[PDB]
């Protein structure tokens, strides 16, 4: 299976902010995190 | 490590491996938005 470049780094960056912020709702936090990151490009 | 974190990210990562999307972040926005909708 081809492993996309940047996959581990993407998962790591989300995890670092989950550990810092301790969001009760990981799914809502993912929607917001990945939306913000798409916009930070 | 919060309960649920590894399993949540595994569903996303399975779909990335299956679907080979070109933009991982856009695929994450879509996947977790649709999971939030389903919930």
């Amino acid at each position: 299976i081809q492993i996309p470049p940047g996959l581990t780094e993407l998962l790591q960056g989300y995890t670092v902010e989950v550990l810092r912020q301790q969001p009760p709702d990981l799914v809502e936090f993912a929607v917001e995190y990945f939306t913000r990151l798409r916009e930070a490009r | 490590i919060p309960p649920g974190l590894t399993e949540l990210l595994q569903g996303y990562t399975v779909e990335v491996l299956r679907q080979q999307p070109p933009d991982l972040v856009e695929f994450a926005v879509e996947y977790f938005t649709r999971l939030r909708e389903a919930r």
């Binding site: 492993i3 998962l11 995890t15 670092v16 | 590894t6 990562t13 491996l17």
Partner: peptide, 18 residues
């Protein structure tokens, strides 16, 4: 199999974030 590969990738990313 893809599901086990995904588990390894995720678990390793979480370990690295710590």
């Amino acid at each position: 199999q893809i599901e086990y590969l995904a588990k390894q990738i995720v678990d390793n990313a979480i370990q690295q974030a710590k």
